[PDB]
Structure formats: structure tokens, C-alpha cells
DNA sequence: GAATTAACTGCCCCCCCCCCCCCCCGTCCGACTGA
DNA sequence: TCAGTCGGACTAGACGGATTCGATACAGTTAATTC
């Protein structure tokens, strides 16, 4: 997809349709994204992909860290609760705490 | 999609022969198109004429131009293994040093990385019956450590003409990395006029230690080395020669190593490790004897051997 | 007939590899000769053309190659096995905290994969017992826990050491 | 020998560029030709295209192509060797100290490195028919152990005029590594002005033991030493002089229970180990007699010889 | 004396385990040895 | 006759640790400048 404007239009239309579906049918839309390295200053850090316009196309944004052998689930943007940090890990039984 | 074996009869074959090919395990035109000729004709009652006919039918029906492992092995089975002058080393390497591949030798200080190069530069001119390669030799130098009087000793040991050997070894001296890389175009130009059997670079990574220094210049050094090795691989593949290069060593000054017998690793990072095919590790032995160990090889197990450096060149340890 | 059912190709450039995967591979898979694709070194062409200041074209090429490979594998139900090289950490993230080496080609290539393995060999410092020590480790997978085992290379092939799997 | 840099402007180079190259340290065409493009780029007034033109002109002037081994062998046979003042040492070295390569001597204290340096400084002025080099001598001192009385004694031994011998030796004292490296440009200027035939750096690695102390300064020390050795090598190649350096030793504390009962190895590491062409290992015998051993050489077998230190300098073991 | 501009420094936290020898500088004498 | 050389007892043997290096902008603090 070389044309960025077409991608932006498609993404905006998709987000509008998904939020319309969620509000019309009383659903809970779950979307998955990817991280991209950004070489800021001189120390590269990971930021979500799909540009900056897409940043506020989702009601709630969650980010999963790695830190040091410890998985952290940090809330990023939400209209209800302040951002914080919570640890977690995956067991052979699924998504679990501790 | 695939064309079933039930299409051969429209091309000029009877039901009997196409069935005979069908129950032989083959079930499509694609399988029989690339099938070996001897395996096609080893069936009793199969004539060579109809075999060639059906092969032509498949060739004009099946898209050709695809290499196969059996054809790849049976087409390039005439490779040459130049003798190193030592029976133990020849046994360890299973006949000597192959062509069409890059072999590197790395070690410290007084190990025999230059004596071996000289001996190979002499022995590569021997007839194939005597274990040579029947060709000239190219010696690219980066440290000014080329001695013709060392080649004369080997030429006298093998009973060759002294003046003829020194006429077949082209020589060149490199003063930097740019000159070293630029010499390869001249080498490619020269390899068309005559037949060469060996190409020696000593040392491949000697100048990179001082041309690029510090962490800031690491990436450019690695890319330049990678491009140089790619050019060497292209030359070896195109002209079917044997490329032998030498490397250096660096110490391990951290506490991870514990055996404490002067830990050391070859320089160049991962590019030189991945580019080369066979790697040898030479270490010092008692007296003038030396120990050669296979560091990496795609079709050989790690082992050890002992040789010596004598007045006539690299040989076997005396009793 | 093991020999006659293996096809070998040679490439030298990134563009040559792209043309090969775009043209020659679909012809072989569609007609049914083969159902397995192996790339000897995907990282080798990309390490000789792009420097640290040319990340965008490399990312574009990697994305195109990954998309093409995934499309072919999904269409013809043929597994794709890619062989990769490694680069050291050079300690001054992506899940590698105390590992001395990490897979090359950055995170853009890592987003295109499904199951990521890693073969490691402990050098004579840890291999002073007489024989080399080889361990095959599972890094990530949608349905596999992070595990490891041991194996040895002999004249017959690669064989895993029984009773060595780690939990 | 070398062509002065004042011949480049005849090929289409402005005088300001030549002057800038002269402040850069390049005083001959050979010096410019061997230099990589990166070195030329770091000049303030030189751009990439200017460097390209200068390199093209230098390559036009200087031959840097391939050559048959016969020509190299014929050209090598006329190099000069300088006698060491001892018959046993000359027989061991097959003529004496070669010109055009780096020769290093190492050992513990009172082993006779400085005396050998003085003897070489005097004997290098002899006529070629007597084993000399017919040139001048350059002495770079980093310890403060330069005494002209030894030179006078050796000159009286060889029947030369003392005043003339002292007038043909250049002396400089180095106080730190940065000053030690800075002395290799005035050396180039003096060598292009007048014919020199020797260069003694004693001690080469004395100041590195103190300028960089711990393991946290190993990398910088090794890089600095490598750059210094590269400058020495380029001087030797450009002017065809003999480069003799001295080294020190360090104990082997781990020991490993070896027979030597006092193991010791030279300092500097793999850098100076791979850079030096010939190395000599000196140790004390009985009374005033010492023993010299070949530690590394591309064309000399491993052997030992015995010399002595007399009131007239280095000489054969007097009975 | 003071408003104003200019120059030198700084950005940081993990390795606590312990088979491993390696190619001689032994110091030298007793006896072998072939010439 | 005579010195180089293989092989080796010679009164006696254990010991441990050690660190750095990148490619970079703006504020804090101290020093120079003209009214
Ligand atoms: N005629 C000869 N007879 C016996 N031994 C010899 C002879 N000529 C050289 N040697 C020995 O061969 C070795 C030569 O080492 P060589 O030049 O191969 O080292 P290298 O690995 O190239 O070193 P560097 O890293 O300095 O390039 C020395 O140990 C020397 O004693
Ligand atoms: N005039 C002289 N006559 C005889 N012997 C002398 C004379 N002058 C010096 N020596 C000898 O020189 C020896 C020391 O040699 P020299 O100065 O070359 O040592 P070195 O190896 O360079 O030492 P360092 O490591 O301290 O630099 C002394 O032990 C002494 O016997
Ligand atoms: Ca390999
Ligand atoms: Ca050397
Ligand atoms: Mg060498
Ligand atoms: Mg001294």
C-alpha cells in the first residue's frame, strides 16, 4: 500500500463502522495492533504503528511491556480511569494474574 | 493444475508403455520429466529410443529449467582437491582442499598460516594425477610477508622446475581496504585469459583492524567486509577456483572463560563466520610441530591432526 | 527417490530473491512437485545492501517478502522454513534480557513469523566435557510453551537426546 | 627513492591542495597513493572529488598492479642487511637485520637491548661492502638511557671518527604516547630531506604500561598501539629503512606448573604479535654472555645463538 | 556594578560461581651414543 | 679418543583476581563583554 491517503481513509471508515456496530448491537470490539521502533533523540523506543492520526480512533488503548522478564499491562488512554501499570503472566491455563 | 499420467497416449505412446511407467511409482508428467535416464531405462523391456521420445514429449509438455539434486550432484562431481603437502592434513580434510569454496585458517602469532599458503601456492601446479590442480596461483598480500625462496624449497622438494614455479604465481600487494577490494576486478579480468586453480588472500582482515577503529566505525567495517566476501564468493562460483584466506585472533578479557589457557576467538564477527565454508584453527605444539583442528565444516566432524614446518615446507612430524 | 524430488536454486541479490519468490516458486508449488520451501539464509542478502540509515527500504522489502511467502503458504498449504542469523546484544525490550545474541533483521521481520525457534551451541568454555553441547529452544508460538531440549549431530543426521526437555 | 609530493601539481593540482597535504603529513607521492580515501577526506580544504582526482593522479604515478613472482624475487635479492657486530648473530639471521620490515627485540632487564640498539646505530653507517647500510640513524628514546659513550666505543672499535659518527645520529625524547606518535611526522620530513637507513624506537611500549593502567583502558591502548605500528609500517614501506623496536615482559601469575620455573611473555598482545615481522628473544647466560633466539620469522628456522657484551659493544663471546 | 552573552558538563546499576591443565625460560648431570 | 644429545632425580609446593568503549540537544552553573 504505497498510497498513504487511501490507507488513512480506509482506516477512518473502518473505525467509524466498528464503533457504529458496537453502539448499535451492544458489543465489545477488540482490535489488535503492532509496535514500531521510533529513533527519537538517540535512544529508540517502541510506539504503536499506523501513524498518529489513528491514535485516537479507539476508545481504550492498552500496551503490553516486557521490562525485565516481567510482562506488564499498562493502560494508556481511557475516558474513565487514570493510567497505571499492572503485572501479569501466561500460564498453561491462560491469562492469569500474579 | 498438475497434468495426470493419462495424457501421454495423445502424445504418441500406447497404453502398455504408459501403464508400465504408471505402476513404476510415477503418476504425473512432472515426475517423469525430471526422472533420471538410467532409472528410466533400467526397467526390463524399456528401449532407449522410446525413452528419449517420451523424455522429449515431457520436455515439450513440462516446464523445464529447474535444477534437481541428483543432476546437481552428477554434474559437478569432478571437483578437485589440492594436496596440502602433509599426509595427516590430507587425511583429516579427506583428500585436501576443495575448489569452488572459501577456506579460512585462523590462529595466533607463530602458527603456520603463511607456510601453508606458500605450500599450496606451489602444490597447486602439480598434475591432477599427482594431487594438484593443474593451474596457476594468485597471491594477494597485505602485510609484505611473501618469500619466493620458500616456494623454491617446495619446488625442489617435489622435483619441479625452479624458474617455472616462480613464473606461474602472480603477486600483488595491498595497502588499504579500497585497494584490496579494487584488486578483485583486475583478478576477474586476468582469470579469463588463463586457467587458475588457487587464490590466496593473506591476510583478509589485517587492514580492517586499523582502517576502522572504535564502536562508531563498526557498521561500515562490517559492511565493507561483507561486500568483499560476496565478491570473493562470486569469483569462486564463476571461475571454479579455490580461495584460501587467513584471519587473526583477539583475546577474551572477561571472567566468563575459566579454562584460562589464553582464551582467543577469531575476529570479523558473524559475517566472516557465515561467508566461509571450512574453518581451521592452528595452535602451537612442542618444538616445530603444530596442531590443526577443524573449527567448522558442513560435511565434516570436528577432529585434530598434527603437522610440522620443515625446511622443505609443510610436512609430517619426523620420528 | 530422494534425489529427484529436491529442487535447488541460487540467488545473489535482494531483487533476485524477490523475483525468484515472485515467479519460480509458485510454478513449482501449483503443479504439485513440492510442498515445502526452505530459504538457506534470508538475512544474508539484506546485510550487504542496507546500512543503519536505510531502514525504510529494507522494511518495505521485508514486508513484501513476508506477505508473498505467507500468501503462498496459505494458498498451497505448504510450510515455509526460514533460516536466520544472529547479532549480539552489545549491552548498554523485545523479551531478550540476559541473552547474549538475538535474531537479526529487527522487529519488522519478527512481526511476519508464526513460530520462532533458536538453535544455540555452548563453546568449549561450557563444552570442555569432551563433546559439543547443542540446545534447541522454542522462543514463541501461539500454542507452545517456552521450552528446550538437546541434540547431537552424527553421520546419520540430527537426533535429540531423550529425557532432556525442560519445563 | 620516493618521489617528492612537489610533482603532483605538474599533473593538474593546485598548490594550496599540495600544501594542505603537506601539513597533513604526506610528503611524497607514495605516501598519498597508499593512503585511503577516508584519510584524505578528513582534510578541511579537500572534498570527495578532489580526493578522487588526487588518488587518480597518484595511481597514475605509482604502479599498484599485479606482478610476476620472478620480478619480486629479483627485486628482493638486492635489499641491504646490517651486521649486528657478532658473527654468531649474523649467521643466525642469515646476513643481519633486514630493511623494509619491522624487527622487535624483547626480554627481561640487563639482557642487552639498549647495547644492541647502540651497536646497530653505529654499524649502520659502514660501507655496504663491510656490512653497513651507508646512511644515517634515528634514535627515539622513551626512557632516558641514551649514552653516546657506547657509540664512541663502538666507533673506536670499528676505526671510524668519533665526531663524524655522533653527527650522523638524530636523537629525540618522548614523554608520553601522544608525543611519541607526534614524532613520526618530523621523522618523515627528515627522511624525505636526507637519506636515512635505520630507526630505533626504544622502548616502544614503555609508556603504554603507565598511560593506560587498568582493564577499562585496554581497548584505547591497543587501538593507539595499532595506529602507531601502522605508521611505522607505512614509514618502512615508503622509505625502505630498517625499523627496530624493543619490548618488555610480564609474568605469568597463573603459572600452570610449567617447567620454566619463571615464565614470562612479552607485552603488547596480539596487535604487536601479528604486526611484527621478526622477533628476537634475549636472555642472560653466564657472566657477560647472553643468548639470542628466533621467536618468529617468515623465512628463518627456530634456532639459538650466543653473543656477549664487551667494553666495545655487542660482539662474539670472548674466550 | 550590572544586563547580556558565552562556554563546560550531564543524562546510573548488572555480573556472587570456582576441573581444566598446552607446549618451556627447566638447572643440571649420567650415561648413550656414534664418530 | 670426544663432545652432542636422550632422559631424567634432583630434600621439600602451594597460592586469584581485575572494566570500559556510540552515534547525540537543552538546561545549570560559571566566566567573559560593553554600557
Ligand atoms: N626454513 C624454515 N625452517 C623451519 N621453520 C621455519 C622456516 N621458515 C620459517 N619457519 C617457522 O615457521 C613459522 C612462520 O610463521 P608464519 O609466518 O606462518 O606465521 P603467521 O601465522 O603468518 O603469523 P603473523 O600473524 O605474524 O602473520 C615460524 O615459527 C618460523 O620459526
Ligand atoms: N661499558 C660496559 N662494559 C661492559 N658491560 C657493560 C657496559 N655498559 C653496560 N654493560 C652491561 O649492560 C648490561 C645492561 O644492558 P642494557 O642497558 O642494554 O639493558 P636493557 O635490556 O636495555 O635494560 P632495561 O630493561 O632496563 O631497559 C649490564 O648488565 C652490564 O653488564
Ligand atoms: Ca559456514
Ligand atoms: Ca608476526
Ligand atoms: Mg603471516
Ligand atoms: Mg634499555
CSV table of N, CA and C (backbone and C1' of nucleotides) in Angstrom, one decimal, chain D residues 256 259-260 262 264 281 286 293, chain E residues 21-28:
chain,number,residue,atom,x,y,z
D,256,UNK,N,50.4,-22.5,35.9
D,256,UNK,CA,50.0,-23.8,35.3
D,256,UNK,C,51.0,-24.9,35.6
D,259,UNK,N,57.6,-26.2,33.4
D,259,UNK,CA,59.0,-26.4,33.8
D,259,UNK,C,59.8,-25.1,33.9
D,260,UNK,N,59.4,-24.1,33.2
D,260,UNK,CA,60.3,-22.9,33.1
D,260,UNK,C,60.7,-22.3,34.4
D,262,UNK,N,60.0,-19.9,35.9
D,262,UNK,CA,59.9,-18.4,35.9
D,262,UNK,C,59.3,-17.9,34.5
D,264,UNK,N,57.5,-16.0,31.5
D,264,UNK,CA,57.3,-14.6,31.2
D,264,UNK,C,57.1,-14.5,29.7
D,281,UNK,N,64.3,-13.1,21.0
D,281,UNK,CA,64.1,-13.4,22.5
D,281,UNK,C,65.5,-13.4,23.1
D,286,UNK,N,75.9,-16.7,31.3
D,286,UNK,CA,76.9,-16.7,32.4
D,286,UNK,C,77.8,-15.5,32.2
D,293,UNK,N,67.5,-15.9,20.6
D,293,UNK,CA,66.7,-16.9,20.0
D,293,UNK,C,65.7,-16.3,19.0
E,21,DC,P,44.0,-24.5,33.9
E,21,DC,O5',44.3,-24.7,32.3
E,21,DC,C5',45.6,-24.9,31.9
E,21,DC,C4',46.2,-26.2,32.5
E,21,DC,C3',47.3,-26.9,31.7
E,21,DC,O3',48.6,-26.7,32.4
E,21,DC,C1',45.7,-28.4,32.5
E,22,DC,P,50.0,-27.0,31.6
E,22,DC,O5',49.8,-26.3,30.2
E,22,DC,C5',50.9,-26.1,29.4
E,22,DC,C4',50.6,-25.8,27.9
E,22,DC,C3',49.4,-24.8,27.8
E,22,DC,O3',50.0,-23.5,27.7
E,22,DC,C1',49.1,-26.7,26.4
E,23,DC,P,51.4,-23.1,27.1
E,23,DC,O5',51.4,-23.9,25.7
E,23,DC,C5',52.5,-23.6,24.8
E,23,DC,C4',53.6,-24.6,25.0
E,23,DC,C3',54.4,-24.9,23.7
E,23,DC,O3',55.8,-25.0,24.0
E,23,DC,C1',53.5,-26.9,24.6
E,24,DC,P,56.9,-24.4,23.1
E,24,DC,O5',58.0,-23.7,24.0
E,24,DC,C5',58.9,-24.4,24.8
E,24,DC,C4',59.6,-23.6,25.8
E,24,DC,C3',60.9,-24.2,26.3
E,24,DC,O3',61.8,-23.1,26.7
E,24,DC,C1',59.3,-24.2,28.0
E,25,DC,P,63.2,-22.9,26.0
E,25,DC,O5',64.1,-22.0,27.0
E,25,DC,C5',63.7,-20.6,27.2
E,25,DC,C4',64.3,-20.2,28.5
E,25,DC,C3',64.5,-21.2,29.6
E,25,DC,O3',65.5,-20.8,30.6
E,25,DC,C1',62.6,-19.8,30.1
E,26,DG,P,66.8,-21.7,30.8
E,26,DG,O5',66.4,-22.7,31.9
E,26,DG,C5',65.7,-23.9,31.6
E,26,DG,C4',64.6,-24.3,32.6
E,26,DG,C3',65.2,-24.6,34.0
E,26,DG,O3',64.7,-23.6,34.9
E,26,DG,C1',63.5,-26.2,33.3
E,27,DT,P,65.8,-22.7,35.7
E,27,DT,O5',67.1,-23.6,35.9
E,27,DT,C5',68.1,-23.2,36.8
E,27,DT,C4',69.2,-24.2,36.8
E,27,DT,C3',70.1,-24.2,35.6
E,27,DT,O3',71.5,-24.2,35.9
E,27,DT,C1',69.4,-26.4,36.2
E,28,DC,P,72.6,-24.5,34.9
E,28,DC,O5',73.0,-26.0,35.1
E,28,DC,C5',73.4,-26.5,36.3
E,28,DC,C4',73.2,-28.0,36.4
E,28,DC,C3',74.1,-28.8,35.6
E,28,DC,O3',75.3,-29.1,36.3
E,28,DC,C1',71.9,-29.7,35.5
